[PDB]
Amino acid sequence: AQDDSTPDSLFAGLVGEYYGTNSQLNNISDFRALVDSKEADATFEAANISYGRGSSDVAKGTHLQEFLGSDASTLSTDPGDNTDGGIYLQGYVYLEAGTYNFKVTADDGYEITINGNPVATVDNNQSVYTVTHASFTISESGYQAIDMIWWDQGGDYVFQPTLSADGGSTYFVLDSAILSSTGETPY
Ligand SMILES: OC[C@H]1O[C@H](O[C@H]2O[C@H](CO)[C@@H](O)[C@H](O)[C@H]2O)[C@H](O)[C@@H](O)[C@@H]1O
Ligand SMILES: [Ca+2]
Ligand SMILES: [Ca+2]
Ligand SMILES: [Ca+2]
Numbered sequence: 614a615q616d617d618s619t620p621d622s623l624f625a626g627l628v629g630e631y632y633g634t635n636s637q638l639n640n641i642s643d644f645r646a647l648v649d650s651k652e653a654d655a656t657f658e659a660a661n662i663s664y665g666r667g668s669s670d671v672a673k674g675t676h677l678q679e680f681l682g683s684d685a686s687t688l689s690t691d692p693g694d695n696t697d698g699g700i701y702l703q704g705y706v707y708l709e710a711g712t713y714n715f716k717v718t719a720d721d722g723y724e725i726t727i728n729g730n731p732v733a734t735v736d737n738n739q740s741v742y743t744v745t746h747a748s749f750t751i752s753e754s755g756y757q758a759i760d761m762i763w764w765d766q767g768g769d770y771v772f773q774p775t776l777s778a779d780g781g782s783t784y785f786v787l788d789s790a791i792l793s794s795t796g797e798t799p800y
């Protein structure tokens with residue numbers, strides 16, 4: 614919901630922020646502290662949350678643009694170089710009441726929360742790895758609050774957090790079909 618004097622862009626995606634640093638990102642706490650420490654180095658619309666894979670540091674050159682792919686045309690600016698970097702996404706996702714679970718492929722780590730509750734966590738650096746996370750429940754159909762963090766400490770980078778509504782038989786990417794930046798219906 615609106616919570617200040619600034620009108621908010623309504624689009625079918627999450628509000629994306631990118632942060633770079635020349636310090637080491639080892640875990641979720643490090644990345645969250647980076648987010649807390651300054652304004653975003655760039656903003657974007659996260660409408661197709663399947664990013665990478667690439668090499669040679671997400672925070673260098675045009676690697677962020679390549680990583681974000683179809684979402685990079687919404688970047689507010691082209692960040693300068695850093696050694697380490699990551700993204701913070703926030704907004705809403707339409708989900709019917711029921712049981713769900715994430716399955717996430719990533720390098721490095723990440724955390725996804727729904728309605729404020731962590732539902733997928735990797736609190737460390739890693740080369741590309743896929744985790745099938747534990748199931749969670751949605752009590753009431755509608756737009757659920759969601760946020761994500763992901764980072765790259767260096768090297769390769771990928772982030773694809775897929776969701777299953779059918780007990781792990783099929784999974785889907787979070788994209789413009791169901792995302793909303795504000796919780797209003799995007800057209
Ligand atoms: O430790 C997390 C990183 O792992 C990889 O990078 C390490 O492993 C590579 C292959 O063994 C080495 O070449 C590299 O020097 C190591 O840092 C991965 O490539 C990174 O993206 C991960 O962040
Ligand atoms: Ca606002
Ligand atoms: Ca900030
Ligand atoms: Ca750049």
Ligand SMILES: [Ca+2]
Pocket residue numbers: 663664665680681682683
């Ligand atoms: Ca892509």
Ligand SMILES: [Ca+2]
Pocket residue numbers: 682683684685686687
């Ligand atoms: Ca685009």
Ligand SMILES: [Ca+2]
Pocket residue numbers: 636637638696697766767
């Ligand atoms: Ca690093």
Ligand SMILES: [Ca+2]
Pocket residue numbers: 720721739765766767768769770
């Ligand atoms: Ca990496």
